[PDB]
Design a protein around this ligand. Structure first.
Ligand SMILES: Nc1ncnc2c1ncn2[C@@H]1O[C@H](COP(=O)(O)OP(=O)(O)OP(O)(O)=S)[C@@H](O)[C@H]1O
Ligand SMILES: Nc1ncnc2c1ncn2[C@@H]1O[C@H](COP(=O)(O)OP(=O)(O)OP(O)(O)=S)[C@@H](O)[C@H]1O
Ligand SMILES: Nc1ncnc2c1ncn2[C@@H]1O[C@H](COP(=O)(O)OP(=O)(O)OP(O)(O)=S)[C@@H](O)[C@H]1O
Ligand SMILES: Nc1nc2c(ncn2[C@@H]2O[C@H](COP(=O)(O)OP(=O)(O)O)[C@@H](O)[C@H]2O)c(=O)[nH]1
Ligand SMILES: [Mg+2]
Ligand SMILES: [Mg+2]
Ligand SMILES: [Mg+2]
Lengths: 318, 330, 258, 492, 354
DNA sequence: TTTTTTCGGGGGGGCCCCGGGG
DNA sequence: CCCCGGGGCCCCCCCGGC
C-alpha cells in the first residue's frame, strides 16, 4: 500500500498557545507577550517532546499574523548555520526593511540552537544588539549550557519542565475523543507510565497501539511499548541475593537481545541516579562498573563479565 | 557472480519475502498490519547480530514497492558517508521530492545508524519531523546507547529477540531439503546450542560440516562432525574435566586437563566457557563460592583475551575452582 | 578487439556526451547491442534519472556480436577521454566476459596511436522501462535561452517554479534577497527557425524543481541547439536534447507541494 | 520613526554620558586619562611613563565579565575626547588577510568623514576591536596581527574582551594597558533600578533589588531583562515571589578552575544532607564544566586540606593514599580515552576516578590557598630538557656507545669532570684541554652550556659557573671562536 | 681525548674479552651469514650488546661498518606535522631509534623501513664466499620502547622482504615485545660480565693510561659497585682517577651519580618522616628529578631497592613495599602521568611504614 | 590565581587553476 | 590573447558525557 496515514503528533500539533498543556506559567507569559507585543530575546530549554518548538511557532504565528512569511526566519540543525550564514543571511534579514503593525518585530527562530558553533554564537551578539529595534531572537534548545554566556545575558530564560501525568492524560483523552479510540484505564496508565513525560512518545505509542491492535489496553500497550530496561537494571542492582540479580540479568536482559555495552551503560547511569543508596557505596559500584565497561570496550563483551560485575557489587553492598 | 550456487550460505539463503523471516512473528505481524492499512510509522529495529533486521526491512521494502524497490528507497549504511552534509543535501532532497517512478510515499533506511555521528543524528530530527506527510524513516541498530534521545523519541521501537529454537530448526530443515543433507538429532541440538540465537553461525557451521563430509549425498552430519569442524569441546570432555577438578588431586586434575586438551587440540577459552555454563546450574549453599568463581573466571578470561601463558592460565582455572568450592564445606 | 568495436569518427562527440551528464551520476551501465548503445542511471539522491541512447548512425563503423554490459565510473571515463585530441578517431573495444574497456585514439595523418584501458565495475542495475506518458504540456525552446534563464534564477532561490498556461510559460524564483519572474510566449520566425519557442498545452501545469538539478541538466545544451521540456502533473518532468542519432533525456521529479 | 515603547529597556536606558555608567569608576577614569594623554605620549615616542604609568602603552585592553558596560564605556570615552571611532566585532571578518587589508591601512590614515564633519582630534581614528575573545583561530585568526599592531600604531587602539586569561590571548601578554571591569556593587545599580521601576509603573521593593542583583551575578543587562519579563505580567514584586523569580532566572554559569577545585574539595557536599542537596550528578556536572583542568586542580590541591570526612580510625595519610591510588587509576583511564580508539564514552567514569572520589576521600576545609596545577610547566620543562638531551646525544653519537638515557645517567657526570672541573681548578690553563675534549665529541659552546644544566642535587653548576672569573669565560669564548671545529651532522 | 670507555671499545669479535660462549655463538652465526635470520639481543644495560652487534656486523661485512655517517630524514603526519629523524648509516647497514618519534614511531616503520625493505641491493659488495652481499642490515635500538602498533607493522615487513634486509634489535628486557615479534626473531641472551672480567678490563685500561694504583682491590670495589654494568664501571674509574690526580688510593671513595644521591636522600626522608607535608616535599623532589630527564621507571626501581636496603624496616614492611612497587610499576606501564603513580607509591609506602 | 597528549568529524580561511567572457 | 568568476583541494583549528 502506497498510502500514508498522517501521524497524530502532526495532525494534532497545537496551533495556538491555549492548546499547549503543561508549564502553565510559561505559556501564560507567552500568551501575554503575544497579546501585548514587544517580544524580547528569549531562550527556551527543556527535555525532548514537551512543546518548545510548538510554543515558539505558535508565538511567532499569533504575533505576526499574515506577515509570518515575510517576518520570520527559521533555521534549525537541518539547515546551514555556519559563521558565513550568521554574518550574511541573518544580518541581511535583520537589516531588511519591513513595515509591521505598531508593536511587532521580525523574529529569527534558531531551533536546536545548542548545536551551533561558538563562532556563530559570537557573531550573533552584535547582530542582536544593533538591530533589536526591528528584530528579536528566539532560541530553542535541550541543553542551555551550550549557549554562550554573552548570548544568555541578552536573552530571557524560559525553562520548561516535564509534563505531569495529568496533562498527558488530558491531551490523550482529547485526542482519543477526536479520533474515536477504544481504550481502557489500564491502557492509558501504561501509555503514560512508558512515556515518562514525553508527549510525542505517548501520542506515537497510542497511535501505534491503535493501528496494531485497535483496543488500547494494558496488554496491547505492553505488546507495542517494551518495558523500560533502565527499570529492569535498577531492579537488578537493588536485588538482595546475588542469585536473584543473576537471574534477572540472564532472563530479562541477556536473553532479550540487549547488548552488554547497553547494559553496562544503563547500570552506570542508574547507579549514578540511585539516591536511595549512600554516596560512597554508589562510588564503589561505579568504580566496578567502570572496570567492567572498560573490559567490554576492549572486546570482552561476555555474560561472564556482567555476572562478575554483579558479584562484585553484591560483595560491596554486603 | 555466475549463479546463486556460488554464494556463501549466509547470503544464498537471505529471505526475500516477509514470509521467509522466522523467529520474529510479533514484529513481522505488526509491520505487515501497518503496511496493509497504510499506517506505517517511523520504525526502529533494535537487535543483536544476525537476527533478521536488514532482511526484514528489505523484505518490507519489496512488499511496499515491489521488484523495483532499489530505485524507490534511499538506503544508507556504515560503508557510506553519512555526515552532516550528507544529511543536509542528499537525505533532505530525497525526502522533499516526489518519486520518479510511482506516486507512493518514500522510504529512507539508515542501516547501522548507531555508527552515525551525533551531529548528523541531530540534523535528522527536523528532516524527520518536517517531511512526515510523504516520507518515512527506518533505523536499524545493535547498540541503543549510541542513538540520541531526540531520535528515539521520534521512532516506534521493535526489538528483535535472539532466534528461538523452533525457528532455527525449521530453517535448518529448509536448508537440508535444499542441499540434500542429513542431520542427526544430536547434531542439530549441538548446532542450536553453539548458535546462541544467530542464524549466520548456524549457516556457516552447516556449510563447513557439508564440506567436511567425504560423500555428502549419503553421509550424515553427526555431533562428532560438528565438534571436529568447529573444533569445540564435547560435553563429555567438559564433564570429565570438571569432575577431575572437583574430585581429584592437583596432579590428577592437571594431567586430565592436559590430556583432554591435547586429544583434540581444544582451546582453554572454550573449556572455561563450557564449565561456566555447567556450573551456572549448580545449587551452591554459600554465595561466596559463586562470587569467587565468577570473579576469578572473569579475570582469567580477560587475561586470556590478551594472550599470555596457556599452562599458567589452565592451572589458574583449576586452582580458582578448587579454592571457590572449598567454601561449600562451611 | 573481437566482440565490440565502435569507431567515433570524431572523438569529441563522445567526450561531449559524457560531459553532458557526468556531474549528475557517477556509476553508469552501458548496454551495447546490434542497434547501438543505451545507458540509464539514477542519481545518488534518487531524484534525477539520466537516459542516453546512441544509434549506429553515430559511428563510422559499429560491430557488436552479442549484448554486452559495461559498468563504468564516469569520472575515470572523463579523465581518459580528456587525453584525446579533437582530430583523432576514437575506437571503443571490448571482448567477451570483459573486465576492461579499451579506448583507442588514432591520428592517421600523424600516425599517432594512444591506447587506454579502463577497468569495469560490477553494477547491479536493471534497465527500468521509462514508460511513455501522455504529458499535459510539451514545449521546445533554444537550449541557450533556457540555460541563461536557469542560471539567472538560481542566483535568487534553490527552487524554481515553472507554470505552463495558455500561450504563456513562466519561470519564477523567490528567495531571501528578492524574487524574479521570466515570462515567455510561443513565437515563430520563418527567417531563423532556431530561435523559435514552441508550445502545445492540454492542461495548465505548475511544478517546482530544485535549482541544483536544473543547473546540472542545462549542461546538456552543448549537445543540441534546442531542448524539449515535457511537463505533466503527477509525473516527472522530461528534458530531452536530441543528437544526430539518439538523444539524452533527464527525468526530474518535482518537489512535494506541501 | 520607531516608537519608544517598542524598544528594549537596555536600549531605552543606555548610558548617554560617562557619568551615567554605574561602577568601575576607577577603570573608566584610568581609560579616560590614558586616551587623553595619547598625543603627549606620541610626542615622546611612548617612552616617558607618566604619573599613572600609562605612557609606555599605545593600546588599551579593557576586560571583565559580561554585561558590565565595557563597550558603552569605551564608546563614550571615544566620543567625549572628540576622536572618530572605527569599530569592529565578531560580526565582521578579521582574519590575517582581512586585517592586513582593512584595519592595517587605517592605523596611520586620516578620516575622510572626520575631515568633512569638521576639535584638533576629529580627523583621527580610535580603533575599537570588540569581542576579541570571539576571534577563533591561531596564527591566521588575526589575533597575532592585532598583537603586532598594538606594538605599531599611529592612533589610539582599544581592545575589549571577556576572558583575558585565555591561551588565545597570550600574544597580548604585555602589549597593552590592562583595564579591569568588575561586578558593580549593588548600591551603584540600585539608583538606576529604582528609576527604571518608577518610570515603568510597577512595584519594586528596595530590598528585593539586592537579591535580584545577586541572582544575575553583576549583570546589569540581565537585571533589566529580568525586570522587564517579570513586570510583563506580575507588576507586584513582593517578598512572596522572591524565591520563584530568583530560581526561574538563575543563569547556569560554568565554574572556573579555582572555583571548581574549591567546591569539589568542600566537605559539606559529601555529608548525608549535603549529598542529598548537592547530588553525585551535580558533582559530575561540576567536573564537566572544565574536564581538561579539573583533574589537574584536584591532583594539585588534594594534599592541602583539613579533612572533615575521615572515617572512625582512619588518619589523614590513609585517605590521601586512597585518593592517590584512585588518581592513578583515573590517569590510566585518561590514557585509554586519548588513544587511537577515541574512547570518549568513558569520560564520565574518568570524572569519578580523577576528581570526585579522591575529593570525597579528603574533602574538608582548605588549609591554604587553592594553587594552580604545576604539572603543565613541569611537563614543558621536561620536554625542553629532553630536546636538549636529544641534540647533545646526536652530536656525540659517533664517539659514544649508548642511548640518550644512558648518556644522561652515565656519561654526563664524567663529562663534567673533563669540561667544568678543570676550569675550576686550573683556570685559564684548562682552556685548550677542554676544547680538545669538545672537539672529540663534536661539542659546541651551546652544547657545553646545555650540558652544564642537567645536573641536580649536590652537583648543580649554577653558582659554581657563576663564580668563575669573567676573564676565564671570555678566554674560553674567544679561543673557541678563533679556531675551526669539526661537524658531525653536515646536512646538505 | 675520548673517554676511556669509548677509546678502548673492542672493534672485532676476536677483541671481546668476556662471555666467551657468546663470542663462539656469534662466530658460528657469522660463519655462513647468507641465511642469517633476524636477531634480537636481550640483556642487562651496559653489558656490551651494541658492541657485540657491531662486531658481528664487522665480521659479516668488514671494517667499513665502522665508517658511520649521520643523515636527517623528513616525515609528514596525517595533520601535516613535519618530523625529523636522525639516521646513523654505513655503507653496509643502517641504524634507527624509532622511539625518538614517540607515538609517531609507526610512521618510521611504515615508510622508512619499508622503503629500505622494498629496495633491492644492486651494489657489488664481494664477500668472503666470492658472491656479492645480498641483504642490508638495519639496527633498531631501544626496540623495547616501540609502541605495539609499530611492532605490528614490523611483522609482514620482516616476513616479506627477508631477502633484502635483516633486522638486529637490542633490548634491556623482552617483556614489552609482543609475541609475534619474538616469534620472528632469533633470541640471544647477553649476560653481564663477571667481577673478575670487569677487573681485568679495568686493569688493562689502567696500565694503558699509566694510572698509579695502590692495590688491585680498588678495581674489585669499582666492579662490585657497578653491579655488572661495564660502562658504569669504566666511567667511574675515569671519574675517580680525575678526582685523585690520576692516583687511586685504597681509601678513595666510590663516586655516585647526582640522581642516585637525590633518590637516596628521598628514601631517607621517607623512612624518617611519614606525613602529608613530607609527601608534598617528596612530590617536589620527584618533579625536580623528572624535569632533568630521569625516567620514571628508573626512579621507581631505584627508590624501591634503596628502601629495601634500609636496616630499620622489618620483613612485613619490605614485603608491602615490594608489592606496592610491583603494582605501581604496572600502573606506570599503563599510564601517562608518571608523577601521579610515583606519588601514589610513596603515599602507600608511607602508610605501610606506620 | 595560571595554562598537555590522539583519530575522526566538522568548520572555515586560503589559495589554485580551469573555464568562460570580452 | 588576457582578465575575472567560481568550482575544487589544501591547510589549520577546535570538540569529544548526560
Ligand atoms: N505541551 C504539548 N502539548 C500538546 N502537544 C505536545 C506538547 N508537547 C509535545 N507535543 C506534541 O508532540 C509533538 C512534538 O512536540 P515538540 O514541540 O516538537 O517537542 P520538542 O520540545 O520541540 O522536542 P525536541 O527538544 O525538538 S527533541 C507536537 O506536534 C505535539 O503534537
Ligand atoms: N529471521 C531470519 N530468518 C532467516 N534467516 C535469517 C534470519 N535472520 C538472519 N538470517 C540469516 O542471516 C543472514 C543475515 O541476516 P541479517 O538480516 O543481515 O541480520 P542483521 O540483524 O541485520 O545483522 P547485523 O545487525 O547487520 S550484525 C540472512 O541472509 C539470513 O540468511
Ligand atoms: N555600568 C552600566 N550602567 C548602566 N547600564 C549598563 C551598564 N552595563 C551594562 N548596562 C546595561 O546593559 C546594556 C549593555 O551594556 P554593555 O556596554 O554592552 O556591557 P558589556 O560588558 O560590553 O557586554 P558584553 O561584554 O559585550 S556581553 C547597556 O545598554 C545598559 O542598558
Ligand atoms: N675490553 C672490553 N670492553 C667491552 C666489552 N664489551 C663491552 N665493553 C665496553 O663496555 C662499554 C659499554 O658497552 P655497550 O655496548 O654500550 O653495552 P649495551 O648498553 O648493552 O649495548 C663499551 O663502550 C665498551 O667499551 C668487551 O668484550 N671487552
Ligand atoms: Mg523541537
Ligand atoms: Mg544488518
Ligand atoms: Mg561588549
Amino acid at each position: 500500500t502506497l498510502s500514508l496515514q498522517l501521524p497524530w503528533v502532526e495532525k494534532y500539533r497545537p496551533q495556538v498557545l491555549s492548546d499547549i498543556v503543561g508549564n502553565k506559567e510559561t505559556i501564560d507569559r507567552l500568551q501575554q507577550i503575544a497579546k501585548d507585543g514587544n517580544m524580547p530575546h528569549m531562550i527556551i530549554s527543556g527535555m525532548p517532546g514537551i512543546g518548545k518548538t510548538t510554543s515558539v511557532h505558535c508565538l511567532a504565528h499569533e504575533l505576526l499574523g499574515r506577515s509570518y512569511a515575510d517576518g520570520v526566519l527559521e533555521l534549525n540543525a537541518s539547515d546551514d548555520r555556519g559563521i558565513d550564514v550568521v554574518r550574511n543571511q541573518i544580518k541581511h534579514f535583520a537589516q531588511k526593511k519591513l513595515h509591521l503593525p505598531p508593536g511587532k518585530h521580525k523574529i529569527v527562530i534558531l531551533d536546536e540552537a545548542d548545536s551551533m558553533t561558538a563562532g556563530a554564537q559570537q557573531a550573533l551578539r552584535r547582530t542582536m544588539e544593533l538591530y533589536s529595534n526591528s528584530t528579536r531572537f528566539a532560541f530553542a534548545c535541550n541543553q542551555s549550557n551550550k549557549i554562550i554566556e554573552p548570548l544568555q545575558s541578552r536573552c530571557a530564560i524560559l525553562r520548561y519542565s516535564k509534563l505531569s501525568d495529568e496533562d498527558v492524560l488530558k491531551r490523550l483523552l482529547q485526542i482519543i475523543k477526536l479520533e474515536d479510540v477504544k481504550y481502557t484505564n489500564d491502557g492509558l496508565e501504561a501509555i503514560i507510565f512508558t512515556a515518562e513525560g514525553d508527549m510525542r512518545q505517548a501520542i506515537n505509542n497510542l497511535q501505534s497501539t491503535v493501528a496494531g491492535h485497535g483496543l488500547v489496553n494494558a496488554d496491547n500497550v505492553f505488546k507495542i511499548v517494551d518495558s523500560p530496561h533502565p527499570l529492569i537494571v535498577k531492579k537488578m542492582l537493588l536485588a538482595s541475593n546475588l542469585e536473584d540479580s543473576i537471574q534477572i540479568l540472564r532472563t530479562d536482559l541477556w536473553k532479550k537481545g540487549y547488548s552488554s555495552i547497553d547494559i553496562v551503560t544503563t547500570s552506570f547511569r542508574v547507579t549514578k541516579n540511585l539516591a536511595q543508596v549512600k554516596e560512597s557505596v554508589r562510588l564503589e559500584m561505579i568504580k566496578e562498573i567502570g572496570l567492567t565497561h572498560m573490559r567490554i570496550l576492549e572486546g570482552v563483551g561476555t555474560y561472564l563479565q556482567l555476572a562478575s560485575m554483579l558479584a562484585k557489587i553484591h560483595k560491596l553492598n554486603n | 557472480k555466475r549463479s546463486k550456487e556460488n554464494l556463501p550460505w549466509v547470503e544464498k539463503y537471505r529471505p526475500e519475502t516477509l514470509d521467509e523471516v522466522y523467529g520474529q512473528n510479533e514484529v513481522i505481524t505488526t509491520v505487515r498490519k501497518f503496511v496493509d492499512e497504510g499506517k506505517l510509522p517511523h520504525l526502529l529495529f533494535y537487535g543483536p547480530p544476525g537476527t533478521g533486521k536488514t532482511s526484514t526491512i528489505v523484505a518490507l521494502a519489496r512488499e511496499i514497492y515491489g521488484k523495483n524497490y532499489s530505485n524507490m528507497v534511499l538506503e544508507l549504511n556504515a560503508s557510506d558517508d553519512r555526515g552532516i552534509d550528507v544529511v543536509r543535501n542528499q537525505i533532505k532532497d530525497f525526502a522533499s521530492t516526489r518519486q520518479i517512478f510511482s506516486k507512493g510515499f518514500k522510504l529512507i533506511i539508515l542501516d547501522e545508524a548507531d555508527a552515525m555521528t551525533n551531529a548528523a543524528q541531530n540534523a535528522l530530527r527536523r528532516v524527520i519531523e518536517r517531511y512526515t506527510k510523504n516520507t518515512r524513516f527506518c533505523v536499524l541498530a545493535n547498540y541503543a546507547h549510541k542513538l540520541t534521545p531526540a531520535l528515539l523519541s521520534r521512532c516506534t521501537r521493535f526489538r528483535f529477540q535472539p532466534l528461538p529454537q523452533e525457528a532455527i530448526e525449521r530453517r535448518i530443515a529448509n536448508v537440508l531439503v535444499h542441499e540434500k543433507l542429513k542431520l542427526s538429532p544430536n547434531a542439530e541440538k549441538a548446532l542450536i546450542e553453539l548458535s546462541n540465537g544467530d542464524m549466520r553461525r548456524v549457516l556457516n557451521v552447516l556449510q563447513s560440516c557439508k564440506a567436511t563430509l567425504d560423500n555428502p549425498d549419503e553421509d550424515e552430519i553427526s555431533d562428532d562432525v560438528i565438534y571436529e569442524c568447529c573444533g569445540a569441546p564435547r560435553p563429555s570432555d567438559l564433564k570429565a574435566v570438571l569432575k577431575s577438578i572437583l574430585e581429584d588431586d592437583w596432579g590428577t586434575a592437571h594431567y586430565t586437563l592436559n590430556k583432554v586438551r591435547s586429544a583434540k587440540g581444544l582451546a582453554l577459552i572454550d573449556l572455561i566457557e563450557g564449565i561456566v555454563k555447567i556450573l551456572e546450574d549448580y545449587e551452591l549453599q554459600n554465595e561466596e563460592t559463586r562470587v569467587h568463581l565468577l570473579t576469578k573466571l572473569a579475570d582469567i578470561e580477560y587475561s586470556i583475551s590478551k594472550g599470555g601463558n596457556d599452562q599458567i592460565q589452565g592451572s589458574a582455572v583449576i586452582g580458582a575452582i578448587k579454592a571457590s568450592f572449598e567454601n561449600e564445606t562451611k | 578487439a573481437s566482440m565490440l568495436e565502435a569507431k567515433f569518427e570524431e572523438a569529441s562527440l563522445f567526450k561531449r556526451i559524457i560531459d553532458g551528464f557526468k556531474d549528475c551520476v557517477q556509476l553508469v551501465n552501458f548496454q551495447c547491442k546490434e542497434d547501438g548503445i543505451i545507458a540509464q542511471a539514477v542519481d545518488d539522491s534518487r531524484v534525477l534519472l539520466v537516459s542516453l541512447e546512441i544509434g549506429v548512425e553515430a559511428f563510422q563503423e559499429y560491430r557488436c556480436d552479442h549484448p554486452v554490459t559495461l559498468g563504468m565510473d564516469l569520472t575515470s571515463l572523463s579523465k581518459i577521454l580528456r587525453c584525446g585530441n579533437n582530430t583523432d578517431t576514437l575506437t571503443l573495444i571490448a571482448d567477451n566476459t570483459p573486465d576492461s574497456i579499451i579506448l583507442l585514439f588514432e591520428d592517421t595523418k600523424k600516425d599517432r596511436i594512444a591506447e587506454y584501458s579502463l577497468k569495469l565495475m560490477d553494477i547491479d542495475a536493471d534497465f527500468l522501462k521509462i514508460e511513455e506518458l501522455q504529458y499535459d504540456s510539451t514545449l521546445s525552446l533554444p537550449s541557450s535561452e533556457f540555460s541563461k534563464i536557469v542560471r539567472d534564477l538560481s542566483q535568487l532561490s534553490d527552487s524554481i517554479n515553472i507554470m505552463i498556461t495558455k500561450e504563456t510559460i513562466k519561470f519564477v524564483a523567490d528567495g531571501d534577497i528578492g524574487s524574479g519572474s521570466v515570462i515567455i510566449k510561443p513565437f515563430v520566425d520563418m527567417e531563423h527557425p532556431e530561435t523559435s519557442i514552441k508550445l502545445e498545452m492540454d492542461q495548465p501545469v505548475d511544478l517546482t524543481f530544485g535549482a541544483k538539478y536544473l543547473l546540472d541538466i542545462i549542461k546538456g545544451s552543448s549537445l543540441s541547439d534546442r531542448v524539449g521540456i515535457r511537463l505533466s502533473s503527477e509525473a516527472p518532468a522530461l528534458f530531452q536534447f536530441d543528437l544526430k542519432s539518439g538523444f539524452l533525456q533527464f527525468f526530474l521529479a518535482p518537489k512535494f507541494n506541501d | 520613526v520607531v516608537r519608544e515603547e517598542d524598544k528594549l529597556w537596555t536600549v531605552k536606558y543606555a548610558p548617554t554620558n560617562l557619568q551615567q555608567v554605574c561602577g568601575n569608576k576607577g577603570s573608566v577614569m584610568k581609560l579616560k586619562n590614558w586616551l587623553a594623554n595619547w598625543e603627549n605620549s606620541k610626542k615622546n615616542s611612548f617612552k616617558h611613563a607618566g604619573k599613572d604609568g600609562s605612557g609606555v602603552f599605545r593600546a588599551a585592553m579593557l576586560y571583565g565579565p559580561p554585561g558590565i558596560g565595557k563597550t558603552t564605556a569605551a564608546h563614550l570615552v571615544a566620543q567625549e575626547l572628540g576622536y572618530d571611532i572605527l569599530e569592529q566585532n565578531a560580526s565582521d571578518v578579521r582574519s590575517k588577510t582581512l586585517l592586513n587589508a582593512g584595519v592595517k591601512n587605517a592605523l596611520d590614515n586620516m578620516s575622510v568623514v572626520g575631515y568633512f564633519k569638521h576639535n584638533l582630534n576629529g580627523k583621527h581614528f580610535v580603533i575599537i576591536m570588540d569581542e576579541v575573545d570571539g576571534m577563533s583561530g591561531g596564527d591566521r585568526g588575526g589575533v597575532g596581527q592585532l598583537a603586532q599592531f598594538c606594538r605599531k600604531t599611529s592612533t589610539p587602539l582599544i581592545l575589549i574582551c571577556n576572558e583575558r586569561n585565555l591561551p588565545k590571548m597570550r600574544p597580548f601578554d604585555r602589549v597593552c594597558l590592562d583595564i579591569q571591569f568588575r561586578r558593580p556593587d549593588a548600591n551603584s545599580i540600585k539608583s538606576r533600578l529604582m528609576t527604571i521601576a518608577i518610570r515603568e509603573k510597577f512595584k519594586l521593593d528596595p530590598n528585593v533589588i539586592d537579591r535580584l542583583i545577586q541572582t544575575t551575578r553583576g549583570d546589569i543587562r540581565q537585571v533589566i531583562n529580568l525586570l522587564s519579563t517579570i513586570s510583563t505580567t506580575t507588576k507586584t514584586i513582593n517578598h512572596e515571589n522572591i524565591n520563584e523569580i530568583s530560581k526561574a532566572w538563575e543563569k547556569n554559569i560554568a565554574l572556573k578552575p579555582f572555583d571548581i577545585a574549591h567546591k569539589m574539595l568542600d566537605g559539606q557536599i559529601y555529608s548525608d544532607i549535603g549529598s542529598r542537596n548537592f547530588t553525585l550528578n551535580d558533582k559530575i556536572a561540576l567536573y564537566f564544566d572544565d574536564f581538561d583542568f579539573t583533574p589537574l586542580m584536584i591532583q594539585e590541591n588534594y594534599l592541602s586540606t583539613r579533612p572533615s570526612v575521615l572515617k572512625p580510625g582512619q588518619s589523614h595519610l590513609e585517605a590521601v593514599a586512597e585518593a592517590a591510588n584512585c588518581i592513578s587509576l583515573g590517569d590510566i583511564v585518561e590514557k585509554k580515552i586519548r588513544s587511537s580508539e577515541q574512547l570518549w564514552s568513558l569520560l564520565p567514569l574518568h570524572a569519578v576516578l580523577s576528581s570526585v572520589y579522591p575529593a570525597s576521600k579528603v574533602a574538608g576545609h582548605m588549609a591554604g590557598r587553592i594553587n594552580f596545577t604545576a604539572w603543565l610547566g613541569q611537563n614543558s620543562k621536561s620536554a625542553k630538557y629532553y630536546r636538549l638531551l636529544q641534540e647533545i646525544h646526536y652530536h656525540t653519537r659517533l664517539g659514544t656507545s649508548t642511548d640518550k638515557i644512558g648518556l644522561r645517567l652515565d656519561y654526563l657526570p664524567t663529562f663534567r669532570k673533563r669540561l667544568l672541573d678543570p676550569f675550576l681548578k686550573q683556570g685559564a690553563d684548562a682552556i685548550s684541554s677542554v676544547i680538545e675534549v669538545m672537539d672529540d665529541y663534536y661539542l659546541t659552546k651551546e652544547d657545553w652550556d646545555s650540558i652544564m644544566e642537567f645536573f641536580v642535587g649536590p652537583d648543580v653548576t649554577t653558582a659554581i659557573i657563576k663564580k668563575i672569573p669573567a676573564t676565564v669565560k671570555s678566554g674560553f669564548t674567544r679561543k673557541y671562536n678563533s679556531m675551526t671545529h669539526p661537524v658531525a651532522i653536515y646536512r646538505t | 681525548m675520548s673517554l676511556w670507555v669509548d677509546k678502548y671499545r673492542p672493534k672485532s669479535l676476536n677483541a671481546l674479552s668476556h662471555n666467551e660462549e657468546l663470542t663462539n655463538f656469534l662466530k658460528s652465526l657469522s660463519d655462513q651469514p647468507r641465511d642469517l635470520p633476524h636477531l634480537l639481543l636481550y640483556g642487562p644495560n651496559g653489558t656490551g650488546k651494541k658492541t657485540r652487534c657491531m662486531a658481528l656486523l664487522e665480521s659479516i661485512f668488514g671494517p667499513g661498518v665502522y665508517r658511520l655517517k649521520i643523515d636527517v630524514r623528513q616525515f609528514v603526519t596525517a595533520s601535516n606535522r613535519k618530523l625529523e629523524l636522525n639516521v646513523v648509516s654505513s655503507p653496509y647497514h643502517l641504524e634507527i631509534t624509532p622511539s625518538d618519534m614517540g607515538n609517531n614511531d609507526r610512521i618510521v616503520i611504515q615508510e622508512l623501513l619499508k622503503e629500505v625493505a622494498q629496495m633491492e641491493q644492486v651494489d657489488f659488495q664481494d664477500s668472503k664466499d666470492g658472491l656479492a652481499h645480498r641483504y642490508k642490515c638495519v639496527i633498531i635500538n631501544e626496540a623495547n620502547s616501540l609502541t605495539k602498533d609499530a611492532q605490528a607493522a614490523l611483522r609482514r615487513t620482516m616476513e616479506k622482504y627477508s631477502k633484502n634486509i635483516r633486522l638486529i634489535m637490542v633490548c634491556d628486557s623482552m617483556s614489552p615485545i609482543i609475541a609475534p615479534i619474538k616469534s620472528r626473531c632469533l633470541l640471544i641472551r647477553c649476560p653481564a660480565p663477571s667481577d673478575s672480567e670487569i677487573s681485568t678490563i679495568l686493569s688493562d685500561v689502567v696500565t694503558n693510561e699509566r694510572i698509579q694504583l695502590e692495590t688491585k682491590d680498588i678495581l674489585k670495589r669499582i666492579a662490585q659497585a657497578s653491579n655488572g654494568n661495564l660502562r658504569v664501571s669504566l666511567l667511574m674509574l675515569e671519574s675517580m682517577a680525575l678526582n685523585n690526580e690520576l692516583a687511586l688510593k685504597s681509601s678513595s671513595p666510590i663516586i655516585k651519580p647526582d640522581w642516585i644521591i637525590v633518590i637516596h636522600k628521598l628514601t631517607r626522608k621517607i623512612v624518617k618522616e611519614r606525613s602529608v607535608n613530607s609527601l608534598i616535599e617528596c612530590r617536589a623532589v620527584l618533579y625536580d628529578l623528572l624535569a632533568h630527564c630521569i625516567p620514571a621507571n628508573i626512579i621507581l626501581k631505584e627508590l624501591t631497592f634503596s628502601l629495601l636496603d634500609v636496616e630499620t624496616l622489618n620483613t612485613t614492611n619490605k614485603s608491602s613495599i615490594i608489592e606496592y612497587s610491583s603494582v605501581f610499576d604496572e600502573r606506570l606501564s599503563l599510564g601517562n602521568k608518571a608523577i601521579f603513580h610515583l606519588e601514589g607509591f610513596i603515599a602507600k609506602v608511607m602508610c605501610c611504614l606506620d
